[PDB]
Amino acid sequence: GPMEQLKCCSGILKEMFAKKHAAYAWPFYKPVDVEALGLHDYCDIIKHPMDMSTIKSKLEAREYRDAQEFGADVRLMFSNCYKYNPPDHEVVAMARKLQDVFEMRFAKM
Numbered sequence: 001g002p003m004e005q006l007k008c009c010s011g012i013l014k015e016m017f018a019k020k021h022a023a024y025a026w027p028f029y030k031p032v033d034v035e036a037l038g039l040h041d042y043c044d045i046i047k048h049p050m051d052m053s054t055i056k057s058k059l060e061a062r063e064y065r066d067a068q069e070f071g072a073d074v075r076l077m078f079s080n081c082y083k084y085n086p087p088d089h090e091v092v093a094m095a096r097k098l099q100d101v102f103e104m105r106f107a108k109m
C-alpha cells in the first residue's frame, strides 16, 4: 500500500541522515546556499533545487503520493549535483556514494 511505502521512504531518508553516512552525506542535508558558497550561476543551471531537509519536509506533509514521487526528488537532488559540477569534483564523488546507499535501500524496499 502507498502508506507503508511512505513509511519506508521516511526510514530510507532517516538512514541517509545517520552518522554512518555523514562523511559523504553532509553537503546534501540542507538546500544549496548560493550566497554563502558563491555559486552565481547555480540558479541559472539548476532550475529545481532539492535537498534532504526539503524532502523530509515534503514527506512530513504528504506531498509525495507514493514511493516513486519520493524517489524522483531524491534522484533530482543527485542529478542537480551531477549536472552542475565537473564530473571529477569531490562533491560528485560524495553524491555517488550517497546515491549507491539510496538506490540499494530503494530497490530492496
Ligand SMILES: O=c1cc(N2CCOCC2)oc2c(-c3ccc4c(c3)OCCO4)csc12
Binding pocket: 026, 027, 028, 030, 032, 033, 037, 080, 081, 084, 085, 091
Ligand atoms: O552541486 C553542488 C556544488 C557545490 N560547490 C561548492 C564547492 O565546490 C565547488 C562547487 O556545492 C554543493 C553543496 C554544499 C557544499 C558545501 C557546504 C554545503 C553544501 O552545506 C553546508 C556548508 O558546506 C551541496 S550540492 C553542491
